[PDB]
Amino acid sequence: REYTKHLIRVENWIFRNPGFALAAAAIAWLLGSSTSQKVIYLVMILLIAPAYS
Amino acid sequence: REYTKHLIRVENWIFRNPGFALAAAAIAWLLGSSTSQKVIYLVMILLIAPAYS
Amino acid sequence: REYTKHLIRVENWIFRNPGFALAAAAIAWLLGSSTSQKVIYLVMILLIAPAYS
Amino acid sequence: FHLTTRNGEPHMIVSRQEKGKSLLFKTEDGVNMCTLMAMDLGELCEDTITYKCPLLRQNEPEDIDCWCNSTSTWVTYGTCT
Amino acid sequence: FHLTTRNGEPHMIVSRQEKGKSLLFKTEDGVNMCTLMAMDLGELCEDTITYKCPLLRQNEPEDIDCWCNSTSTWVTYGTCT
Amino acid sequence: FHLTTRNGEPHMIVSRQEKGKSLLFKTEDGVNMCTLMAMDLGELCEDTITYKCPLLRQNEPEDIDCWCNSTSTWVTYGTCT
Amino acid sequence: GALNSLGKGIHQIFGAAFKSLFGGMSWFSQILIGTLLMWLGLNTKNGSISLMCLALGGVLIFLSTA
Amino acid sequence: GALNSLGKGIHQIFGAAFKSLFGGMSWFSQILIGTLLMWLGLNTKNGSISLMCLALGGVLIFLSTA
Amino acid sequence: GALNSLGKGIHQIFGAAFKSLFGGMSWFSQILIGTLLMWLGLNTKNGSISLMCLALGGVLIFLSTA
Amino acid sequence: YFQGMRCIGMSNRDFVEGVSGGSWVDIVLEHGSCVTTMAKNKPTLDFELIKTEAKQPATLRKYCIEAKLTNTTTESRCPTQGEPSLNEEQDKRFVCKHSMVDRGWGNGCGLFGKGGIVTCAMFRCKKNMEGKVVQPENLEYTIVITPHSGEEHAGKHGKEIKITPQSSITEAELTGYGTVTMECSPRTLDFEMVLLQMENKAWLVHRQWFLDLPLPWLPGADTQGSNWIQKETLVTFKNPHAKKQDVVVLGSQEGAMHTALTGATEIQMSSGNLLFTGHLKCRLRMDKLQLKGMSYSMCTGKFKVVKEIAETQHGTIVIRVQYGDGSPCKIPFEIMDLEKRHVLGRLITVNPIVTEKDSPVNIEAEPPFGDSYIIIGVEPGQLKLNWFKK
Amino acid sequence: YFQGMRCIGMSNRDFVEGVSGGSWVDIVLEHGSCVTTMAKNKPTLDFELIKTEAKQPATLRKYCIEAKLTNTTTESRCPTQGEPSLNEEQDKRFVCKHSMVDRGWGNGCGLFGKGGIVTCAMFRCKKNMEGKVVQPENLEYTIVITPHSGEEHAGKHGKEIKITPQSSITEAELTGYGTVTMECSPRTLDFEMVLLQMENKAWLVHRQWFLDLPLPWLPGADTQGSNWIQKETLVTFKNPHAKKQDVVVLGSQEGAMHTALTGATEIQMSSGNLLFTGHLKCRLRMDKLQLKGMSYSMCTGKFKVVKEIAETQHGTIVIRVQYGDGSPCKIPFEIMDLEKRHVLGRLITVNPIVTEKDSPVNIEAEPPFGDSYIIIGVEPGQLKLNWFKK
Amino acid sequence: YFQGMRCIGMSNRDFVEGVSGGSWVDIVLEHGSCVTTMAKNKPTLDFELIKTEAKQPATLRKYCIEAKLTNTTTESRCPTQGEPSLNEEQDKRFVCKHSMVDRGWGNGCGLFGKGGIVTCAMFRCKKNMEGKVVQPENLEYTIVITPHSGEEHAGKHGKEIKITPQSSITEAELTGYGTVTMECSPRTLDFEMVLLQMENKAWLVHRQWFLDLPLPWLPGADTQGSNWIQKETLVTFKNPHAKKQDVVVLGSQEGAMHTALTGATEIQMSSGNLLFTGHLKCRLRMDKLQLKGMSYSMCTGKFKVVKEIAETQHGTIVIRVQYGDGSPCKIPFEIMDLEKRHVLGRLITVNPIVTEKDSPVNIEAEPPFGDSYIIIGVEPGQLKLNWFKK
Ligand SMILES: CC(=O)N[C@@H]1[C@@H](O)[C@H](O)[C@@H](CO)O[C@@H]1O
Ligand SMILES: CC(=O)N[C@@H]1[C@@H](O)[C@H](O)[C@@H](CO)O[C@@H]1O
Ligand SMILES: CC(=O)N[C@@H]1[C@@H](O)[C@H](O)[C@@H](CO)O[C@@H]1O
Ligand SMILES: CC(=O)N[C@@H]1[C@@H](O)[C@H](O)[C@@H](CO)O[C@H]1O
Ligand SMILES: CC(=O)N[C@@H]1[C@@H](O)[C@H](O)[C@@H](CO)O[C@H]1O
Ligand SMILES: CC(=O)N[C@@H]1[C@@H](O)[C@H](O)[C@@H](CO)O[C@H]1O
């Protein structure tokens, strides 16, 4: 269970709320404003989203 | 008879008088003075010629 | 005999004297001084040479 | 051999056991003696061959392995072994 | 025919006049009867052929024109005519 | 057959019914026997052929179907049937 | 022959046109309208004179058959 | 056929991208995000307008299946 | 061989011309008309000198057969 | 049924008229066409070239195409004794061949070796063909000159005349009208060619092909029909034998010939004569012709149009009429305008006349274009028939 | 083991659905593939084209490839006496040849020279091959229509129907659901070609090659099998002798043929019929189909997933379940979201039902992408099974 | 009839002369041509290459082209008992083959199945051909050196000498004149080729073709003529039978060979030797030659021109003359101008002399171009003959 236990949580919480993804890019494109450097946010955000920390 | 009755009358009256044709062109060439536009007369004249109207 | 009788005389007299030919060109090259016009001499001379006229 | 006919002419059905022996059969015109020299003469079977043995009077045979001396005869034999 | 041998085995030199007749020759093991059915058997000459006539006990012959019934024998004959 | 001549030489007009039989006719030099072997000998008609039968003394015949043994003779016969 | 080929060729075309434009009548009809044209050849000025003075002969000849 | 060869060719690539970027939902979800794009085609200014005003049709058609 | 092909080639032409122009006589006849040419090679001035000074050798050699 | 109808029914019909008087008029005659001539106060005539045939043209060569052989004889000598011979080898009716054949003791010779042999057979031709040469001259054209009267039949033939490019000017008599004089020229028909005859059926073939045919032949001027040249073409000599040799003749070549001529222009013929489609140019004079019937009375009576007026292929009409009050008479024909003021059109039938009471007298006339009155007859019932020519 | 499994296990599977009602739906059938059709309130069906064979195609030509000879007979005549003959030369079962051979005194002839000889042998074919012509029509396609129910087996065959491009629209009955109507077209398979049969093994060969084969043959419509054409192809006549001539037959050509056909497309076959891999385009109507089992009760009980839920190659799943409290009943299937608020996905198996207690009822369904709850059953233990589709 | 005439009558004749004294003079010898050499105070000589032949060239391979077979013997074993054998299978004069044949109860075997059989026949070649290899060396050229004297015949042969490209410088003696020394080189004739001999008739053929010929052969250095290689090329083994097998030999191949060589350059030959048309380059020295007859008297007498003076193909003349008052003497010949002042032209015949009274002494001379007097003899009747050379 330790292999998928960190992943499976995310793959659920998105299927419940598509939203935080939809606006994520807005947080992204307004943060760091360069390509990859602006992508790492859109991963970091959608990843910190299903978390409580 | 209705098919040739309008034509046959003309085809006679000319064979009786060649004349109105001979001078027709004079009426023609002095009327409208352009090619076809001067021909339509020489047809209209020789056609109104065997008529009473 | 009438065909070669005019020629054979010359073809002898030269074989006897090569000379009049050897100096002929001198008479030639100093007479008329153009190519053919200077050749006709060297023929006319060597031809009048074996003659008595 | 069985003596029969082929269009009025005598016909010989020759079997294997007759190879090498003079073939004699009576005919109105006396006794006929045919000579069979066929090297390929074998057993009577489906593979037959049939041909004529010419009459030969005081003439040496040439290009043939069958001939009679009194009356032309047809001959038939198998080639099986 | 002239009876000779080929490696201890009996050998028959068969001439033309024997075509069609039973070949008999005495042997320690009784009398031997060879049967020659060669269609091409001709005159003894330079063109010879030589081969063996197998022993055949109560068996029908197949694909052969020579066989004996008591002791295998070699046979030789010419094909000339 | 009708016996006539062709330039002093005897001439034989052979009909159909004589096929296969010895032809004999007397001559100052004894009796002459011609032999006719013509396979195509038929009925006397317009299609005749005429040729010579050579004299043959103790010699076998070769490439011929007619010959006499005492005096060369001409022969004629039809080929019709 | 070409000259004979085009002979009927150039004639049939030029002919029918003359069998329509003119072709009214004969005798004193043909000669008049004929003769008047030959006048235009002598006079006029402009080039057409080349055609008219010929056309007269065209008519007069057909009147000269007799 | 080339046109059929590239037909699946140009479609599968452009398609999957559309099966990821968009592809959230249907009905009143698809039409909205669809309809708003068609607005950008009328307005804007810059060239992208060439892509957006088309992308609307891309969405609206998938909503027009019915 | 080319060199042998043209060998008879360039020779037969140049040869016959020399069998006509010169070719008068031999011994003291050939050498004289020969020797005088070799003089023209030393002297002269103009280029022909290139041909004359050679032509002497042409003659002298035919006199040097012996 | 009436005289002059043949030409009216033809699609190819020329109308010729003389622009002078007593002058010559030219006309062109072709097979299948006719020419109608007219002149002031002269009858109208019809001319037709109906036949063009060569009479007894020179026979070039007779080719045998089927033969038989009889009395085949063979003679041969031994090696060393020269070439044998047969006297029939001098008889032109035989075909012979000389050869060499092996000989020897087996057939009467002392030596073995090649000997001379000879064989002859009488050659009898059973079927031959002959090619003829047609000379432009000696060709004979048949021309019919028919009076265009309209008289009836259903005894009135046009004069038939036969001429040759070598015959002089013809003076043809036309019963009742006088004579017509004419001369013709075969004006352009070729003859380095030849005409091959295979039993009443002929063909036109090129020369040098006819002359090259590999068949026995005889010079044209022959009558023996025996001394054939190159008989070996139909004969085959088998390999000889010491004293005999067979000779066989090929089979008929009529077939090999037929299926060999396919392609070449076939020529019709009859009575042994060859026929062609000729072309003539003629000139005729009518000064000796005159109208048949002048000086009669002008019919004073009635006519009933026998049947429906007919339109010809030549802008003309044929009116059948039959008297009525009178002698065998002239007819009053006249085509005028609707007002009967001036005369229009003209007659092709001229001086139309009636020979019998109840004798349909066909009349061909040319109505002007448009409207016209066809006035037949006189004052009891002058027959006004309206007509419109389109 | 269950009905509709065959198509689920296939990699080539098309899903088709009608965009209308009562309308025709088009589908394309191929060998090795299947098509699943669906419609509102209609059962889901599976279609497969399993066989394509030509039945009794016209036989073009029979070629003999192995023969024997019997009763060989020879006849010959002397030089001069024409061509000999044998009456069997008129018997179509014999092969004969005419030749010439030297003759002379040594063999019964009067003259030395060439003579005519003739030899015949009865020809008996022992092994032949035949080429047939397959007509596009008369081709017969076999199609199986299987109800996608999920029922079990391990008696439930799909309806099998055979059609021809000439047969009319088919009305196939599906026990329990009604009938389905469909029509097909062999829509693009070529036949100037020929199908060669060498003893139960066939090949497709081009024409004009088959027709050029140097072997004895007989026109297709034969049954005698005796009168072979061009027998000389398998027969060899040795040089003749004065009175006899040998004739030998070539050996079998089956081998020369086999190693000669390598390369040409081999064609399978059975029961004498040729088989091909066909291609069909069909249209079907479902207005006469209906769900089997409507008007039952909604199972009110329990199910135990027989075994591990399976994932198909088509974004679908197959859930085995077996009742439990109730009649042979309808099943409550429903795929919702994690919150059980809305319905997601759909069934491929429709109106899934239980026929027996302890009867594994396979069910194929399509879960939406991502997360979903598979709710099987009712309120004692409605079976919430989580599922994630990647 | 006179010495030196052969070369005068040849169209291809070269005139060579040494530009030095005691030096070597080069000449080119060809078949059909001759070369005439001249030098101050030396006799004029004629050279001709008449023969070029290879003597005993190495024999490469002997091919048998016709053979016979005798003592054919067969041996065979039953299935299971290995390969049979015959000791003659070790005798190189036999051709043998190993095969398999069906066996069984019908022919002396216990088992039915394939058995081993072997057959041999003595091979006797009756006619063969042989190809030889001609080496450039060992070729022998024959050259005739004839003194150009004009003497008569109708005993006076030119010296004949045979040389090889390996022989040393030749010193040929010419009776009466001394010796002439010469050396030759076969200066460019090719030999990877081969010369095929089919019974006294030969051909030049390429190698690898000769070596590939499918015929029995033997290595060149053989004399047995029995142990042929690849005899099977002329032998055919029929299908075997249980105890016997027939073997036949092909017929002669002389014909197949002849009509196979058509095209390849044919080579003449005689006495077993091959002949070619050679080409030589030689150098000769005349320091040991001298005039035959020096130190005689100058004929003081008369000559009568035997016949019409002749013109040769080489700008020269041949005058026949016969004494007259004197010893076998020198002749006074001299060609001058019309005035008899200077000497013109020259003699090809040198030191012309008379051997007998009434012995026509031919003399070849070269008159200058144009007019000249041919002065033969001395002061009773010095013979002034006018001559014109065109
Ligand atoms: C025509 C003739 O020659 N007849 C005899 C015949 O009587 C005899 O039987 C046979 C052998 O004995 O030899 C010939 O055939
Ligand atoms: C082994 C055997 O069968 N022996 C007999 C032999 O005694 C007899 O001589 C022959 C024909 O008579 O038939 C067999 O060969
Ligand atoms: C020359 C000669 O041999 N004469 C005889 C003849 O007497 C006899 O008539 C004939 C047949 O009987 O056989 C020969 O011809
Ligand atoms: C004329 C005839 O055919 N009869 C006999 C025949 O029976 C006998 O076989 C032959 C010699 O054996 O001699 C024949 O003459
Ligand atoms: C045993 C043996 O070989 N002796 C005899 C033999 O001499 C005889 O030829 C044969 C029948 O003729 O019968 C055999 O038994
Ligand atoms: C000499 C001669 O010709 N006379 C007879 C002949 O009559 C007879 O026919 C023949 C034999 O039958 O014997 C011949 O000797």
Coordinates of C-alpha atoms in Angstrom, one line a residue, chain H:
Chain H
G1 CA -5.0 7.3 -49.7
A2 CA -2.9 10.2 -48.6
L3 CA -5.8 12.4 -47.7
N4 CA -7.1 9.4 -45.8
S5 CA -3.7 8.5 -44.5
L6 CA -3.0 12.0 -43.0
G7 CA -6.7 12.2 -42.3
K8 CA -6.3 9.9 -39.3
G9 CA -2.9 11.3 -38.9
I10 CA -3.6 15.0 -38.3
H11 CA -6.6 14.1 -36.4
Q12 CA -5.2 11.7 -33.8
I13 CA -2.6 14.2 -32.7
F14 CA -4.8 17.3 -32.6
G15 CA -7.5 15.1 -31.2
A16 CA -5.7 13.8 -28.1
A17 CA -4.6 17.3 -27.2
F18 CA -8.3 18.2 -27.3
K19 CA -9.0 15.1 -25.2
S20 CA -6.8 16.5 -22.5
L21 CA -6.9 20.3 -22.4
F22 CA -10.6 20.5 -22.7
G23 CA -12.7 17.4 -22.0
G24 CA -13.9 18.4 -18.6
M25 CA -17.7 17.9 -19.0
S26 CA -20.7 18.2 -21.2
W27 CA -24.0 19.9 -21.7
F28 CA -24.1 23.3 -19.9
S29 CA -20.4 22.8 -19.0
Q30 CA -19.2 22.3 -22.5
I31 CA -21.4 25.0 -24.1
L32 CA -20.3 27.7 -21.7
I33 CA -16.6 27.3 -22.0
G34 CA -17.4 26.8 -25.6
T35 CA -19.5 29.9 -26.1
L36 CA -17.1 32.2 -24.3
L37 CA -14.4 31.3 -26.7
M38 CA -16.5 32.3 -29.7
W39 CA -16.7 35.7 -28.1
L40 CA -12.9 36.0 -28.2
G41 CA -13.0 35.5 -31.9
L42 CA -15.2 38.5 -32.5
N43 CA -13.1 40.6 -30.2
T44 CA -9.4 40.4 -29.2
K45 CA -7.2 42.0 -32.0
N46 CA -4.1 39.9 -32.3
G47 CA -4.0 36.8 -34.5
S48 CA -4.7 34.1 -32.0
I49 CA -8.2 35.1 -32.8
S50 CA -7.8 32.8 -35.7
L51 CA -7.5 29.8 -33.4
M52 CA -10.0 30.7 -30.7
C53 CA -12.9 31.5 -33.0
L54 CA -12.4 28.1 -34.5
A55 CA -12.0 26.3 -31.2
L56 CA -15.5 27.4 -30.2
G57 CA -16.9 25.5 -33.2
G58 CA -14.8 22.6 -32.0
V59 CA -16.6 22.6 -28.7
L60 CA -20.0 23.6 -29.9
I61 CA -20.1 20.7 -32.4
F62 CA -19.3 18.2 -29.7
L63 CA -22.2 19.8 -27.8
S64 CA -24.4 19.7 -30.9
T65 CA -24.2 15.9 -31.3
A66 CA -27.4 15.3 -29.3

